[PDB]
């Protein structure tokens, strides 16, 4: 039955995320090849082909890029909500606790999964059809050059763990089903659900990664690292909100960030 929980979570992940690690690696290995964005000329070219509606009329390049960042996050929140609804037991939680778990978990899950589309030189964007370089993102004017580099730093060490989609699906489920989120109504029930998922994760890692006896505590630490990564990201987004008047924040993301940390 524990194998069944792991399989059901893996299947829910493959169904609900447009990108998975196998799909990303096929693209990054070299139909629909990714357009490389490494400078302003190629950003503008990519925009006209991949987000044409955005530039059909323009705001600084950094602000257009941040808009695309937010649009990606909004889409991934939808994918995570559907994934969560398919996590065995999640739908038996109080509806308001479901909202709370998503509120506090989506950006931890976003940055964990972002690692799957990152390598040391850049990342896949726009449903796998663009590859934006890490150096180009670092080249943007402040504060926008500060968004992605900590996420690359997290991803390089996370990717060195050589997890596959069967591991990552359980890891993301564990992120979502966290009993210590603020404001939960049924802490005990969520703690027991989490314990079940974490139990399956521990056993799955033991079987799938027999070479690394520390892999489970490494991943527990990555969960903690992601919390700090999100707090820091929320702080930067707040700097953007107050100082970059042209950088409209999407209302769903505003709701997630509100009263968070």
């Amino acid at each position: 039955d524990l194998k069944s929980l792991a399989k059901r979570i893996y299947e829910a992940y493959l169904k609900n995320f447009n990108m998975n690690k196998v799909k990303a690696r096929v693209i990054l290995s070299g139909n629909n090849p990714p357009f490389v964005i490494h400078d302003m000329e190629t950003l503008c070219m990519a925009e006209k082909t991949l987000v044409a509606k955005l530039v059909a009329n323009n705001k600084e390049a950094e602000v257009r890029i941040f808009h695309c960042c937010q649009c990606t996050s909004v889409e991934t929140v939808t994918e995570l909500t559907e994934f969560a609804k398919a996590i065995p037991g999640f739908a038996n939680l109080d509806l308001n606790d479901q909202v709370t778990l998503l509120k506090y978990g989506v950006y931890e899950a976003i940055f964990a999964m972002l690692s799957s589309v990152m390598n040391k030189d850049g990342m896949l964007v726009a449903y796998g059809n663009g590859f934006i370089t890490r150096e180009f993102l670092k080249s943007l004017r402040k504060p926008f050059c500060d968004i992605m580099e900590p996420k690359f730093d997290f991803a390089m060490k996370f990717n060195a763990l050589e997890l596959d989609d069967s591991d990552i699906s359980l890891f993301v489920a564990a992120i979502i089903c966290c009993g210590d989120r603020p404001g939960l109504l049924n802490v005990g029930h969520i703690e027991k659900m989490q314990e079940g998922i974490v139990h399956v994760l521990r056993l799955h890692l033991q079987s799938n990664h027999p070479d690394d006896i520390f892999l489970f505590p490494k991943l527990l630490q990555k969960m903690a690292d992601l919390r700090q990564l999100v707090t820091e990201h929320a702080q930067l987004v707040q700097i953007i909100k107050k100082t970059e008047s042209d950088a409209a924040l999407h209302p769903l993301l505003q709701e997630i960030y509100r009263d968070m940390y």
Binding site: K85, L102, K103, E255, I256
Partner: peptide, 11 residues
Amino acid sequence: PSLLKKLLLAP
């Protein structure tokens, strides 16, 4: 009726 709750309720 929040936006997140509306996502959760989507069929």
